[PDB]
From Swiss-Prot, chains A, B:
Source organism of this protein record: Pyrococcus abyssi (strain GE5 / Orsay)
Keywords: Hydrolase
GO MF term (any one): nitrilase activity
CN hydrolase domain mapped to chain residues: 1-236
SUPFAM superfamilies for this protein: Carbon-nitrogen hydrolase
EC code(s) of this entry: 3.5.5.1
Pfam families reported for this sequence: CN_hydrolase
Protein name: Nitrilase
Residues annotated as catalytic: E41 (proton acceptor), K112 (proton donor), C145 (nucleophile)
Thermal dependence of activity, per record: Optimum temperature is 80 degrees Celsius. Active at a broad temperature range (60-90 degrees Celsius). Highly thermostable with a half-life of 25 hours at 70 degrees Celsius, 9 hours at 80 degrees Celsius, and 6 hours at 90 degrees Celsius. Shows a Tm of 112.7 degrees Celsius.
Highest taxon listed in the record's lineage: Archaea
């Protein structure tokens, strides 16, 4: 099974530009055999807002707004499933969300649980929890950007049978590409972190989108500044069986009575 | 304040040789200005038992047994605090434990919660949970080797207020050195992994004892093969403040209602 990230430079407040860019790159990941393609956090709107008004004005509803319908068009046309970061307008309120779409249309969304830094000024903290989406051929967990920092995010996803963690990101700190292999190891899952690149109103993002294996292998890593795709073949049986030797199964060996809440 | 590991080669079934070796190295750590000194998993008995009988015969009671007694003597004479892995006899049961002693006497013990591989044939799973010992001048959390694999181990100790996680280990997998800086980071603690070295009845330990900082920096890492001590200064203020910026505090930011559910 093949999974991909799309690393791209969301132009802030310019969604038609970002659609065009994301279409190009999803098609690229598709041509390379990806059945799952993951885009950055807030790929449509960009990231570094000053006011809520400017993002809210343009943010789209899920699933009926322009970002999701665009992604559905693309999924329909390419036959891939897509996990993509999007500013989600929901009534009066904005979420930093990820939509999941497939060739049959809308699959689901995840709202960023752990808001980072100034996101707290613009976005409501996520309220849907950590969800795993069964695509039939695979179960896809989703978390966004800062979620990587809390091992609980990946853990919750993995415990819920995620084969792959899809991880739209707009990373500013340098730690995530290092931590992601450990998240993948400790849960015995695959992770696909799709980072954006670029400078936005003085803020630079890290690039370094990456795919990580359940043995903490980096199967694919992107540049710091270029828009690109990366793909990796993943072996589902490896992640579905949590044994790490004949006498230890990660999930069976967990002893939650001892884990502080 | 400086903390240290003692990386050593326990000779299986030879506590008196391991005492003398441990004493030598703890004094070294102390001369180097360590106030806290961490020793490997099962430093006194060694690890790779053929049968439960061989370890059961030699395993010492804690605190009244020879291992604790010897460590108390050393703690006193060198003026250091010691965290050390020891096989614990407790009636008919055996635990894979860690003792904590300081210059004035016995502080406490930790019993390995997550048993690895054949340890399940000799030891009972630990039953005292993850404890943090307050030395007055710092709070020392303890976990042992495979415990690192579960992010919950370090998390629990960090949430319980560890400044440092003392981590007696006999690592055989490749992962822990790379994982420990991530554990330090995600918890904003320091970690002191005191691994053993040696090839013991065919099982090869990896060494690479390390002290990781809360910025995921390796402050000291040991060789793969050699017995040695490593010392690093730790900034207590840095770990007692969970702020990662002025809008994010790691512990304030955890959203526990969404975890593992
Ligand atoms: Br536009
Ligand atoms: Br293919
Ligand atoms: Br679908
Ligand atoms: Br939904
Ligand atoms: Br779910
Ligand atoms: Br966790
Ligand atoms: Br000696
Ligand atoms: Br003491
Ligand atoms: Br005790
Ligand atoms: Br291994
Ligand atoms: Br240092
Ligand atoms: Mg909370």
């Amino acid at each position: 099974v093949k999974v991909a990230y799309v690393q791209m430079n969301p132009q802030i407040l310019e969604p038609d530009k970002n659609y065009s860019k994301a279409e190009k790159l999803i098609k690229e990941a598709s041509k390379q055999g990806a059945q799952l393609v993951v885009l950055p956090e807030l790929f449509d709107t960009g990231y570094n807002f000053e006011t809520r008004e400017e993002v809210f004005e343009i943010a789209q509803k899920i699933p009926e707004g322009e970002t999701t319908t665009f992604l559905m068009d693309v999924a329909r046309d390419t036959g891939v499933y897509i996990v993509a970061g999007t500013a989600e307008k929901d009534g009066d309120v904005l979420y930093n969300s990820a939509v999941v779409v497939g060739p049959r249309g809308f699959i689901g969304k995840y709202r960023k649980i752990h808001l980072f830094y100034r996101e707290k000024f613009f976005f409501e903290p996520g309220d849907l929890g950590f969800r795993v989406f069964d695509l039939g051929f695979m179960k896809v967990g989703v978390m966004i950007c800062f979620d990587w920092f809390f091992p609980e995010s990946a853990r919750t996803l993995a415990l819920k049978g995620a084969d792959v963690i899809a991880h739209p990101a707009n990373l500013v700190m340098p730690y995530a590409p290092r931590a992601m292999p450990i998240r993948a190891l400790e849960n015995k899952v695959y992770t696909v972190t799709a980072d954006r690149v670029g400078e936005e109103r003085g803020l630079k993002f890290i690039g370094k989108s990456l795919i990580a294996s359940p043995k903490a292998e980096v199967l694919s890593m992107a540049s710091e500044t270029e828009e690109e795709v990366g793909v990796a073949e993943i072996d589902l049986s490896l992640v579905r069986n949590k044994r790490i030797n004949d006498l230890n199964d990660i999930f069976k060996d967990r002893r939650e009575e001892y884990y502080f809440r």
